[PDB]
Write a protein that binds this ligand. Structure first.
Ligand SMILES: [N-]=[N+]=Nc1cc(C[C@H](N)C(=O)O)ccc1O
Ligand SMILES: [N-]=[N+]=Nc1cc(C[C@H](N)C(=O)O)ccc1O
Lengths: 322, 322
């Protein structure tokens, strides 16, 4: 009945929006290292700042000794996740998505350790199991476990089905089943018992938990990180020029460092908790220090330095000063 | 602008429940012979009396010079049509359905002419195009043309989604898309421009009409035959022993003839119109004759003789008397 303090620690950083059976999860985490997964869809040839918190959270779990499975949606990216989206996602071609998958897999790799013993990271691609799956097999073997009555009640698609100015394609309506099966598949092959995801993923994650129970009779868990907000109410990671990419060829390390330096005083201490590995004690002391220094706050350049090194390494940090 | 009288003729037999753009259809029918389709799902190793009106209606179209496509649902029978059904259909195995498909195809054949020139019948099986279709291709290429908002409003599935004592699987919810694509596929390969079906098929047929427009920009049509009713309110074709099969090994020709002899006076003249090729004039004269004869009505054994010969031929009619 031992209990891990990992979920508590993430909670103090404000990184847990929702979590299933927290008490039970904390006990399972105390049993020993577990395999967990976080997934990313190839919506572009690179991830951007909107995907960084979940990615770093996967790394936070590995640091605590757990094994991270970095899933790239080679199949789901050909369908489109409608969760809390106002309109249909653009449909990209098979050829282009397969190319983007490889780019994202490569971009994700440096963030995790693939050479640290049994909790070494593992890359996954759901195109492996959906790429050649026949439609009748999908509809029968996976589809019979989903109730449409329940599906149309999921909060993630509620507005699309209720607002006269919106609608949802059968294509995107089926997405929840694909991600649900992803959890069951990874549970069966890698022993994955936890899926963490973005703030708009609760329903997709819970469908995976239920399907894993229905298919393999195993209890698994889910956790979502929060929607990252800015005090001024604007969208985090959105600039006049668009997204802030993690690919240095799209958004240079210099520009990336500039983005963080510009962080609002109201957001900077919360952002240090979400985006860096500094301890809560050190961040709290830094906030107190800035409060009584009479100098410009140090928090913005500490944040810029920390995240720039995490994303672009020492080379990018050096490039940010020339 | 010539107009065919075929739809009018079927209407006088009481065989048209619903029909799309009747005026336009009648004009198209006057242009020349068309290819049309009627489909049957392998729910059992034989069809039964509930499937006979649509089957004979396909033959009525061939007699008027049109070309009948007899479709057997090798794929749709692995999914299950939920239209106006109270509960999920039983899921049968791939191996068993494939066997039943062959049996039904063989049972249907004798009802149509496969050797009468250009309007010769053609057998089709939707397993040809769905059997190996990948799920992502289905969801994207067919799925993007369906609105879930519209799908949940179809009368055929309304009760399943609205009544607390019912529910529908994603499996059966997807059926409408399969049958919809069937129409588009047959339109493209065989020039099929009309689909006729059972009384519970309006929505499945209209989805095919809309998808054929969206995919191939061709205007096609649909028609349904009526739910066959009995004056006493009980279900037609239902007996204490179950269904009345068209397979003589399941329901003997003798038993089949007995079923028709037992027809209620209130139903017999309507049944002669639905189930035989006797002219309306002859049936009307027979009703008048029975009205003023002072003898037992001749209608029941005329009906029994006509339908028994149609279903089991001269051999079965002879067997019905020994
Ligand atoms: N498991 N898991 N997580 C997944 C996560 C994603 C991406 C997720 N739908 C997102 O848009 O964040 C795709 C597939 C997955 O299986
Ligand atoms: N086209 N057409 N008609 C079809 C008709 C059926 C059978 C129909 N759903 C029924 O249950 O009567 C199956 C597939 C079809 O494509």
């Amino acid at each position: 009945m031992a209990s891990s303090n990992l979920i508590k620690q993430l909670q103090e950083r404000g990184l847990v929006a929702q979590v299933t059976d927290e008490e039970a999860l904390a006990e399972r985490l105390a049993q020993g290292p577990i395999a967990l997964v976080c997934g990313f869809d190839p919506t572009a040839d690179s991830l951007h700042l909107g995907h960084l918190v979940p990615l770093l959270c996967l790394k936070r779990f590995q640091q605590a000794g757990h094994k991270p499975v970095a899933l790239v949606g080679g199949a789901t990216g050909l369908i489109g996740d409608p969760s809390f989206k106002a309109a249909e996602r653009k449909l990209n071609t098979e050829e282009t998505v397969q190319e983007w998958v490889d780019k994202i897999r490569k971009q994700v790799a440096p963030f995790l350790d693939f050479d640290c013993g049994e909790n070494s990271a593992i890359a996954a691609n759901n195109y492996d199991w959906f790429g050649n799956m026949n439609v009748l097999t999908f509809l029968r073997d996976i589809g019979k476990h989903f109730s449409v009555n329940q599906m149309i009640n999921k909060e993630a698609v509620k507005q699309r089905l209720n607002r006269e100015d919106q609608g949802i394609s059968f294509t995107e309506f089926s997405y929840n089943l694909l991600q649900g099966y992803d959890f069951a598949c990874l549970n069966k092959q890698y022993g994955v018992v936890l899926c963490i995801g973005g703030s708009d993923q609760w329903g997709n994650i819970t469908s995976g938990i239920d399907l894993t129970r229905r298919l393999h009779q195993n209890q698994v868990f889910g956790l979502t990180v929060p929607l990252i907000t800015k005090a001024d109410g604007t969208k985090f990671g959105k600039t006049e020029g668009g997204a802030v990419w993690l690919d240095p060829k799209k958004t240079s390390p210099y520009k990336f460092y500039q983005f963080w330096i510009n962080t609002a005083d109201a957001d900077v201490y919360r952002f240090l908790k979400f985006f860096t590995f500094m301890s809560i004690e050190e961040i709290n002391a830094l906030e107190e220090e800035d409060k009584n220094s009479g100098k410009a706050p140090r928090a913005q350049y500490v944040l810029a330095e920390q995240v720039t090194r995490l994303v672009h390494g020492e080379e990018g940090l050096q490039a940010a000063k020339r």
